[PDB]
């Protein structure tokens, strides 16, 4: 019966910096708000309850304030392990979660490590030919991959998958797969993936050539 | 140490029933209410209700009135969530807790066909020097439903692993995983990917071999 | 067991 409007829905901030998240309740919730951290693959972690009280074991760089309908939550001295989605929770009248804030750490820009892989013998002899490029440990998240066969761009048959941001080094990784049939694969020689990213003024190019192996 | 341990992942068809367990330790089970929280794929947390662990009385949020049942086994310090007449839209990860929380139980509700994956090793082509590190991969293709677990050397390689989220490709899922090791250590120190697909009861190893 | 929040641990 109480709505919770959480803002912003996502943000990026530098290491060592301080961010603030807000929640607005539809009615006075009498300081009965809590804040949670939630990482993929794990249960939520309670950080703050009754607006400003720290859970035992939670560092004081987490803080909260507010009253009435308006509440705020801050993380100071940001570190890579703060990558998570944060939620407010009113518990004055039943419970309601806010919509969440996905937090990204803005580390220094990092170029991808690009690796290309030809189709495996097992996949080929079963009639398929997937060519795979890993673009690993880069920042920021935006990246473009172009595939070329014998020098000509190919867009049909490409699937791209990004990881979430890693706490180990605040980077992303992405996998790009060009899937052809064996029949079409064995009629061409050169297969190339080209990565366009903020960190390079020209594309990062990895290729292999069927006729050379 | 406060710990909540939930039962393992579940695969069900629409119309069936599932019962998920949440076993507490490290605090007095009957002194704190147990809450249940749903996280649908790609969505935020949604509160389902709570159970009074001193009386057994459950309270449900409006969206979870009807097919959902909270219960207890006080003597085993265990809370249960039962979902009757399962729906596709019950597909989600469910968490129990209050201040501390269980690890989550992932529930998949589907009537579609279970299909095992094909598992392909990704080794560098014969004509390229990778530098001081070498990255190896495994392509996991054509399976249903989610999920799969991909490990490297039975989990002993993990610091440099990237697990790429699955994508739907012609009605079936495809995912990949990479690992990176120093070039001096491969092929001399073997690297193998293992792919478990519990829905199809399959486990497949593929040794990575140089081209 | 209550409608409380926080303080466990």
Short mmCIF file of C-alpha atoms in Angstrom, two decimals:
data_model
loop_
_atom_site.label_atom_id
_atom_site.label_comp_id
_atom_site.label_asym_id
_atom_site.label_seq_id
_atom_site.Cartn_x
_atom_site.Cartn_y
_atom_site.Cartn_z
CA UNK A 1 0.00 0.00 0.00
CA UNK A 2 3.12 2.19 0.20
CA UNK A 3 4.90 2.94 -3.07
CA UNK A 4 8.67 3.58 -3.05
CA UNK A 5 10.29 5.65 -5.82
CA UNK A 6 14.04 5.01 -5.89
CA UNK A 7 16.44 7.30 -7.79
CA UNK A 8 18.60 6.97 -9.85
CA UNK A 9 18.03 3.56 -11.44
CA UNK A 10 21.77 3.29 -12.19
CA UNK A 11 24.94 5.36 -11.77
CA UNK A 12 28.70 5.26 -12.32
CA UNK A 13 31.22 6.86 -9.96
CA UNK A 14 34.98 6.89 -9.49
CA UNK A 15 36.87 4.88 -6.89
CA UNK A 16 37.17 6.77 -3.62
CA UNK A 17 34.13 8.90 -4.45
CA UNK A 18 30.77 9.32 -2.74
CA UNK A 19 27.32 8.66 -4.20
CA UNK A 20 23.84 9.24 -2.82
CA UNK A 21 20.65 7.31 -3.61
CA UNK A 22 17.20 8.53 -2.68
CA UNK A 23 13.80 6.93 -2.04
CA UNK A 24 10.44 8.73 -1.82
CA UNK A 25 7.55 6.96 -0.11
CA UNK A 26 3.90 7.64 -1.02
CA UNK A 27 3.12 8.32 2.67
CA UNK A 28 5.03 9.02 5.88
CA UNK A 29 6.85 5.82 6.85
CA UNK A 30 8.03 7.01 10.29
CA UNK A 31 11.75 6.38 9.60
CA UNK A 32 11.09 2.64 9.04
CA UNK A 33 13.27 2.30 5.95
CA UNK A 34 16.19 -0.07 5.36
CA UNK A 35 18.88 -0.25 2.68
CA UNK A 36 20.25 -3.44 1.12
CA UNK A 37 23.16 -4.41 -1.07
CA UNK A 38 22.57 -7.25 -3.54
CA UNK A 39 25.15 -9.01 -5.68
CA UNK A 40 24.34 -11.67 -8.30
CA UNK A 41 24.50 -15.22 -6.99
CA UNK A 42 24.18 -14.15 -3.35
CA UNK A 43 21.48 -13.24 -0.88
CA UNK A 44 20.87 -9.57 -0.06
CA UNK A 45 22.95 -7.89 2.65
CA UNK A 46 21.31 -5.49 5.11
CA UNK A 47 23.37 -2.30 5.47
CA UNK A 48 21.19 0.26 7.24
CA UNK A 49 17.92 0.05 9.16
CA UNK A 50 15.62 2.54 10.91
CA UNK A 51 16.86 5.17 8.42
CA UNK A 52 20.41 5.59 9.78
CA UNK A 53 21.44 2.66 12.03
CA UNK A 54 24.33 0.53 10.75
CA UNK A 55 24.06 -3.23 10.81
CA UNK A 56 26.84 -4.83 12.88
CA UNK A 57 29.87 -5.40 10.68
CA UNK A 58 28.96 -2.75 8.09
CA UNK A 59 31.56 0.04 7.68
CA UNK A 60 30.60 3.62 8.53
CA UNK A 61 31.24 4.74 4.96
CA UNK A 62 27.66 3.51 4.45
CA UNK A 63 25.15 6.00 5.84
CA UNK A 64 21.49 6.93 5.69
CA UNK A 65 19.26 9.85 6.61
CA UNK A 66 15.70 11.01 6.26
CA UNK A 67 12.22 11.40 7.71
CA UNK A 68 8.61 11.60 6.60
CA UNK A 69 8.43 10.55 2.95
CA UNK A 70 12.03 11.33 1.87
CA UNK A 71 15.10 9.18 2.57
CA UNK A 72 18.69 9.11 1.34
CA UNK A 73 21.54 6.58 1.43
CA UNK A 74 25.20 7.27 0.72
CA UNK A 75 28.32 5.22 0.04
CA UNK A 76 31.57 7.11 0.54
CA UNK A 77 35.12 5.98 -0.31
CA UNK A 78 33.79 3.72 -3.08
CA UNK A 79 35.71 0.48 -3.66
CA UNK A 80 35.37 -2.27 -6.28
CA UNK A 81 33.48 -4.59 -3.92
CA UNK A 82 30.68 -1.98 -3.85
CA UNK A 83 29.59 -3.11 -7.34
CA UNK A 84 26.02 -4.29 -6.65
CA UNK A 85 22.38 -3.28 -6.91
CA UNK A 86 21.15 -1.30 -3.91
CA UNK A 87 17.54 -1.29 -2.70
CA UNK A 88 15.54 0.64 -0.16
CA UNK A 89 12.78 -1.14 1.77
CA UNK A 90 9.97 0.52 3.70
CA UNK A 91 8.70 -1.55 6.61
CA UNK A 92 6.26 0.83 8.29
CA UNK A 93 3.19 -0.84 6.76
CA UNK A 94 3.82 -4.26 5.22
CA UNK A 95 7.05 -4.08 3.15
CA UNK A 96 7.87 -2.49 -0.21
CA UNK A 97 11.18 -2.50 -2.06
CA UNK A 98 12.34 0.39 -4.16
CA UNK A 99 13.13 -0.39 -7.78
CA UNK A 100 16.86 -0.57 -7.17
CA UNK A 101 20.03 1.29 -8.17
CA UNK A 102 22.69 -0.58 -10.16
CA UNK A 103 26.10 0.79 -9.16
CA UNK A 104 29.03 0.80 -11.60
CA UNK A 105 32.57 1.67 -10.56
CA UNK A 106 34.22 4.07 -13.01
CA UNK A 107 37.75 2.73 -13.13
CA UNK A 108 40.29 4.07 -15.61
CA UNK A 109 39.52 3.14 -19.19
CA UNK A 110 41.03 -0.22 -20.13
CA UNK A 111 41.47 -1.73 -23.60
CA UNK A 112 40.03 -5.20 -24.30
CA UNK A 113 42.23 -8.24 -24.70
CA UNK A 114 40.89 -9.74 -27.94
CA UNK A 115 41.19 -13.44 -28.85
CA UNK A 116 39.74 -15.19 -31.91
CA UNK A 117 38.94 -18.91 -32.16
CA UNK A 118 38.16 -20.98 -35.27
CA UNK A 119 35.35 -23.56 -35.21
CA UNK A 120 36.26 -26.69 -33.30
CA UNK A 121 36.76 -29.95 -35.17
CA UNK A 122 33.81 -31.37 -33.21
CA UNK A 123 31.44 -28.61 -34.28
CA UNK A 124 32.65 -28.69 -37.90
CA UNK A 125 32.18 -32.40 -38.46
CA UNK A 126 28.60 -31.94 -37.21
CA UNK A 127 27.91 -29.29 -39.86
CA UNK A 128 28.18 -26.03 -37.92
CA UNK A 129 30.90 -23.37 -37.80
CA UNK A 130 30.92 -20.85 -34.95
CA UNK A 131 33.78 -18.33 -34.94
CA UNK A 132 34.26 -16.80 -31.50
CA UNK A 133 35.97 -13.62 -30.32
CA UNK A 134 36.43 -12.89 -26.64
CA UNK A 135 36.87 -9.22 -25.76
CA UNK A 136 38.02 -9.42 -22.18
CA UNK A 137 38.66 -7.10 -19.22
CA UNK A 138 37.76 -3.73 -20.71
CA UNK A 139 36.18 -0.50 -19.47
CA UNK A 140 33.82 1.26 -20.30
CA UNK A 141 31.06 -1.18 -21.17
CA UNK A 142 30.19 0.26 -24.59
CA UNK A 143 32.00 -1.65 -27.34
CA UNK A 144 31.35 -2.50 -30.99
CA UNK A 145 32.40 -5.68 -32.80
CA UNK A 146 32.45 -6.00 -36.59
CA UNK A 147 32.91 -9.36 -38.30
CA UNK A 148 34.46 -9.74 -41.74
CA UNK A 149 34.72 -12.76 -44.02
CA UNK A 150 37.36 -12.41 -46.77
CA UNK A 151 37.33 -8.68 -46.09
CA UNK A 152 33.54 -8.20 -46.38
CA UNK A 153 31.39 -7.20 -43.41
CA UNK A 154 28.97 -9.81 -42.06
CA UNK A 155 26.11 -8.93 -39.70
CA UNK A 156 23.74 -11.89 -39.99
CA UNK A 157 24.52 -14.67 -37.53
CA UNK A 158 26.27 -12.65 -34.79
CA UNK A 159 25.46 -13.04 -31.08
CA UNK A 160 27.04 -10.79 -28.44
CA UNK A 161 26.96 -11.38 -24.69
CA UNK A 162 28.34 -9.08 -21.96
CA UNK A 163 29.25 -10.10 -18.43
CA UNK A 164 28.34 -7.94 -15.47
CA UNK A 165 31.08 -5.72 -14.06
CA UNK A 166 33.74 -7.70 -12.20
CA UNK A 167 34.64 -6.86 -8.63
CA UNK A 168 38.12 -8.30 -9.25
CA UNK A 169 39.14 -5.36 -11.48
CA UNK A 170 36.01 -3.24 -12.25
CA UNK A 171 36.05 -4.40 -15.91
CA UNK A 172 33.61 -6.01 -18.32
CA UNK A 173 34.08 -8.83 -20.79
CA UNK A 174 32.09 -9.70 -23.89
CA UNK A 175 31.80 -12.75 -26.15
CA UNK A 176 30.94 -12.39 -29.85
CA UNK A 177 30.05 -15.42 -31.98
CA UNK A 178 29.60 -15.56 -35.75
CA UNK A 179 27.77 -18.78 -36.64
CA UNK A 180 27.86 -20.13 -40.21
CA UNK A 181 27.34 -23.56 -41.68
CA UNK A 182 30.36 -25.76 -42.38
CA UNK A 183 29.47 -25.53 -46.10
CA UNK A 184 29.75 -21.73 -46.12
CA UNK A 185 32.71 -21.66 -43.72
CA UNK A 186 34.80 -23.94 -45.94
CA UNK A 187 34.23 -21.68 -48.98
CA UNK A 188 36.12 -18.73 -47.46
CA UNK A 189 39.61 -18.15 -46.07
CA UNK A 190 39.89 -15.11 -43.79
CA UNK A 191 37.80 -14.51 -40.67
CA UNK A 192 38.21 -11.27 -38.74
CA UNK A 193 36.68 -9.63 -35.70
CA UNK A 194 37.28 -5.90 -35.18
CA UNK A 195 36.74 -4.24 -31.79
CA UNK A 196 35.89 -0.53 -31.63
CA UNK A 197 36.28 0.96 -28.15
CA UNK A 198 36.92 4.29 -26.41
CA UNK A 199 40.50 3.21 -25.66
CA UNK A 200 41.70 3.01 -29.27
CA UNK A 201 41.56 5.44 -32.17
CA UNK A 202 41.60 2.51 -34.63
CA UNK A 203 39.93 -0.91 -34.33
CA UNK A 204 41.62 -3.82 -32.60
CA UNK A 205 41.74 -6.53 -35.27
CA UNK A 206 42.15 -10.26 -34.73
CA UNK A 207 42.01 -12.68 -37.63
CA UNK A 208 42.73 -16.20 -38.69
CA UNK A 209 43.02 -17.75 -42.12
CA UNK A 210 41.75 -21.24 -42.94
CA UNK A 211 44.33 -21.77 -45.70
CA UNK A 212 47.18 -21.22 -43.22
CA UNK A 213 46.27 -24.06 -40.84
CA UNK B 1 27.97 -17.53 12.47
CA UNK B 2 24.51 -16.71 11.15
CA UNK B 3 23.71 -18.87 8.13
CA UNK B 4 20.58 -19.56 6.06
CA UNK B 5 20.93 -22.49 3.64
CA UNK B 6 18.27 -22.92 0.97
CA UNK B 7 17.50 -26.03 -1.05
CA UNK B 8 18.93 -26.46 -4.54
CA UNK B 9 17.66 -25.35 -7.94
CA UNK B 10 14.28 -26.59 -9.13
CA UNK B 11 12.89 -27.43 -12.58
CA UNK B 12 9.12 -27.85 -12.81
CA UNK B 13 6.29 -27.88 -15.35
CA UNK B 14 3.27 -25.56 -15.14
CA UNK B 15 0.58 -26.93 -12.86
CA UNK B 16 2.99 -28.83 -10.60
CA UNK B 17 3.89 -28.03 -6.98
CA UNK B 18 7.28 -27.13 -5.49
CA UNK B 19 8.43 -26.81 -1.88
CA UNK B 20 11.64 -24.88 -1.11
CA UNK B 21 13.42 -25.09 2.23
CA UNK B 22 15.36 -22.52 4.23
CA UNK B 23 17.43 -23.93 7.12
CA UNK B 24 18.63 -21.46 9.76
CA UNK B 25 21.59 -21.67 12.13
CA UNK B 26 23.59 -19.34 14.34
CA UNK B 27 20.59 -17.51 15.83
CA UNK B 28 17.30 -18.44 17.47
CA UNK B 29 14.92 -19.32 14.62
CA UNK B 30 11.75 -18.54 16.59
CA UNK B 31 12.93 -15.08 17.72
CA UNK B 32 12.88 -13.51 14.22
CA UNK B 33 10.32 -13.56 11.43
CA UNK B 34 11.27 -15.17 8.14
CA UNK B 35 10.52 -13.12 5.02
CA UNK B 36 10.35 -14.42 1.46
CA UNK B 37 11.47 -12.38 -1.57
CA UNK B 38 11.10 -13.09 -5.30
CA UNK B 39 13.51 -11.94 -8.02
CA UNK B 40 12.25 -12.66 -11.54
CA UNK B 41 14.91 -12.76 -14.30
CA UNK B 42 16.15 -9.25 -14.97
CA UNK B 43 13.83 -7.67 -12.38
CA UNK B 44 14.21 -6.19 -8.90
CA UNK B 45 13.36 -7.64 -5.51
CA UNK B 46 9.68 -8.19 -4.68
CA UNK B 47 8.49 -8.88 -1.13
CA UNK B 48 6.17 -11.86 -0.87
CA UNK B 49 5.24 -11.77 2.83
CA UNK B 50 6.54 -13.16 6.09
CA UNK B 51 5.86 -15.92 8.59
CA UNK B 52 5.78 -15.51 12.35
CA UNK B 53 8.22 -18.16 13.54
CA UNK B 54 6.75 -18.15 17.06
CA UNK B 55 3.14 -18.86 15.98
CA UNK B 56 3.33 -20.17 12.42
CA UNK B 57 0.96 -17.47 11.15
CA UNK B 58 1.82 -16.33 7.60
CA UNK B 59 1.10 -12.93 6.09
CA UNK B 60 1.11 -12.57 2.30
CA UNK B 61 1.51 -9.60 0.00
CA UNK B 62 -1.46 -9.18 -2.35
CA UNK B 63 0.38 -10.56 -5.36
CA UNK B 64 1.14 -13.77 -3.42
CA UNK B 65 -2.30 -14.57 -2.00
CA UNK B 66 -3.66 -17.89 -3.24
CA UNK B 67 -1.10 -20.37 -4.55
CA UNK B 68 1.67 -19.57 -2.04
CA UNK B 69 2.09 -21.19 1.37
CA UNK B 70 4.65 -20.38 4.07
CA UNK B 71 5.20 -23.04 6.73
CA UNK B 72 7.66 -24.08 9.43
CA UNK B 73 9.37 -27.06 10.99
CA UNK B 74 10.41 -25.38 14.24
CA UNK B 75 12.30 -28.46 15.46
CA UNK B 76 14.56 -28.34 12.38
CA UNK B 77 14.80 -24.52 12.37
CA UNK B 78 13.50 -24.65 8.79
CA UNK B 79 11.10 -22.38 6.94
CA UNK B 80 9.36 -23.58 3.77
CA UNK B 81 7.83 -21.92 0.73
CA UNK B 82 5.35 -24.04 -1.20
CA UNK B 83 3.99 -22.86 -4.55
CA UNK B 84 0.96 -24.75 -5.87
CA UNK B 85 -0.35 -24.87 -9.44
CA UNK B 86 2.92 -23.49 -10.76
CA UNK B 87 2.94 -20.83 -13.48
CA UNK B 88 5.63 -19.96 -16.02
CA UNK B 89 5.74 -16.52 -14.38
CA UNK B 90 6.85 -18.11 -11.07
CA UNK B 91 10.25 -18.57 -12.76
CA UNK B 92 12.57 -16.62 -10.45
CA UNK B 93 15.11 -16.86 -7.67
CA UNK B 94 13.53 -16.94 -4.19
CA UNK B 95 15.28 -15.70 -1.04
CA UNK B 96 14.46 -16.24 2.63
CA UNK B 97 15.70 -13.98 5.41
CA UNK B 98 15.25 -10.85 7.45
CA UNK B 99 18.55 -9.20 8.38
CA UNK B 100 20.62 -12.08 7.00
CA UNK B 101 19.55 -14.01 3.93
CA UNK B 102 19.77 -17.39 2.26
CA UNK B 103 21.75 -17.81 -0.95
CA UNK B 104 18.58 -18.05 -3.08
CA UNK B 105 16.80 -20.94 -4.79
CA UNK B 106 16.34 -20.66 -8.54
CA UNK B 107 13.05 -22.04 -9.86
CA UNK B 108 12.42 -22.64 -13.55
CA UNK B 109 8.85 -23.45 -14.64
CA UNK B 110 8.65 -24.66 -18.23
CA UNK B 111 6.79 -27.16 -20.38
CA UNK B 112 9.33 -26.95 -23.22
CA UNK B 113 11.60 -29.85 -24.16
CA UNK B 114 14.76 -30.48 -22.16
CA UNK B 115 17.75 -30.67 -24.54
CA UNK B 116 21.40 -31.31 -23.54
CA UNK B 117 24.12 -28.95 -24.79
CA UNK B 118 26.81 -29.56 -27.33
CA UNK B 119 30.17 -28.61 -25.82
CA UNK B 120 32.98 -27.33 -28.06
CA UNK B 121 36.58 -26.54 -27.05
CA UNK B 122 37.95 -23.19 -28.22
CA UNK B 123 41.71 -23.31 -28.76
CA UNK B 124 43.76 -20.68 -30.64
CA UNK B 125 44.35 -21.24 -34.33
CA UNK B 126 47.63 -22.75 -35.46
CA UNK B 127 49.05 -19.46 -36.72
CA UNK B 128 49.10 -16.95 -33.87
CA UNK B 129 51.25 -16.13 -30.85
CA UNK B 130 49.07 -14.99 -27.96
CA UNK B 131 51.83 -13.31 -25.95
CA UNK B 132 52.54 -13.89 -22.27
CA UNK B 133 49.04 -15.21 -21.58
CA UNK B 134 46.80 -17.54 -23.56
CA UNK B 135 43.01 -17.47 -23.42
CA UNK B 136 41.02 -20.67 -23.93
CA UNK B 137 37.26 -21.13 -24.22
CA UNK B 138 34.35 -23.53 -24.29
CA UNK B 139 31.24 -22.95 -26.39
CA UNK B 140 28.06 -24.47 -24.97
CA UNK B 141 25.38 -24.63 -27.63
CA UNK B 142 21.81 -25.74 -28.22
CA UNK B 143 20.48 -26.56 -24.75
CA UNK B 144 17.29 -25.99 -22.80
CA UNK B 145 16.46 -24.92 -20.20
CA UNK B 146 18.82 -22.73 -18.32
CA UNK B 147 21.03 -23.32 -16.57
CA UNK B 148 24.49 -24.83 -17.04
CA UNK B 149 27.53 -24.75 -14.77
CA UNK B 150 30.87 -24.40 -16.57
CA UNK B 151 34.06 -24.98 -14.61
CA UNK B 152 37.73 -25.16 -15.48
CA UNK B 153 39.88 -27.98 -14.08
CA UNK B 154 36.95 -28.95 -11.84
CA UNK B 155 36.90 -25.42 -10.44
CA UNK B 156 40.58 -25.04 -9.57
CA UNK B 157 40.94 -22.37 -12.28
CA UNK B 158 38.58 -19.54 -11.33
CA UNK B 159 40.45 -16.22 -10.90
CA UNK B 160 40.63 -15.52 -14.64
CA UNK B 161 37.36 -17.15 -15.76
CA UNK B 162 34.65 -15.20 -17.58
CA UNK B 163 31.21 -16.80 -17.80
CA UNK B 164 29.12 -15.24 -20.50
CA UNK B 165 25.34 -15.07 -20.01
CA UNK B 166 23.33 -17.38 -22.26
CA UNK B 167 21.46 -16.07 -25.28
CA UNK B 168 18.50 -17.65 -27.05
CA UNK B 169 19.55 -18.89 -30.51
CA UNK B 170 16.84 -20.63 -32.60
CA UNK B 171 14.72 -21.49 -29.57
CA UNK B 172 17.74 -22.93 -27.71
CA UNK B 173 20.35 -21.36 -25.46
CA UNK B 174 24.01 -20.77 -26.26
CA UNK B 175 26.63 -19.56 -23.78
CA UNK B 176 30.42 -19.50 -23.57
CA UNK B 177 33.17 -19.37 -20.97
CA UNK B 178 36.81 -18.31 -21.17
CA UNK B 179 39.85 -18.88 -18.96
CA UNK B 180 43.28 -17.22 -19.15
CA UNK B 181 46.59 -18.77 -18.04
CA UNK B 182 50.25 -17.86 -18.57
CA UNK B 183 51.42 -19.04 -21.99
CA UNK B 184 54.33 -20.92 -20.41
CA UNK B 185 51.81 -23.16 -18.58
CA UNK B 186 49.72 -24.46 -21.51
CA UNK B 187 49.70 -27.09 -22.98
CA UNK B 188 52.24 -28.23 -20.35
CA UNK B 189 49.73 -27.85 -17.46
CA UNK B 190 46.45 -29.22 -18.78
CA UNK B 191 43.25 -27.18 -19.00
CA UNK B 192 39.83 -28.85 -19.24
CA UNK B 193 36.35 -27.40 -19.22
CA UNK B 194 33.50 -29.24 -17.50
CA UNK B 195 29.88 -28.48 -18.39
CA UNK B 196 27.06 -29.63 -16.12
CA UNK B 197 23.46 -29.40 -17.36
CA UNK B 198 21.34 -30.73 -14.47
CA UNK B 199 18.07 -30.63 -16.43
CA UNK B 200 19.42 -33.26 -18.85
CA UNK B 201 21.55 -35.03 -16.20
CA UNK B 202 24.64 -34.42 -18.32
CA UNK B 203 28.25 -33.66 -17.44
CA UNK B 204 30.74 -33.28 -20.30
CA UNK B 205 34.48 -32.63 -20.11
CA UNK B 206 36.51 -31.26 -23.01
CA UNK B 207 40.29 -31.07 -22.75
CA UNK B 208 41.77 -28.04 -24.47
CA UNK B 209 44.45 -29.16 -26.93
CA UNK B 210 46.74 -27.05 -29.12
CA UNK B 211 46.11 -26.78 -32.84
CA UNK C 1 8.70 -13.00 16.17
CA UNK C 2 7.58 -9.56 15.07
CA UNK C 3 7.60 -6.99 12.28
CA UNK C 4 11.06 -5.73 13.29
CA UNK C 5 14.20 -5.13 11.25
CA UNK C 6 17.89 -4.84 12.05
CA UNK C 7 20.23 -5.68 14.90
CA UNK C 8 20.80 -9.39 14.35
CA UNK C 9 24.47 -10.34 14.57
#
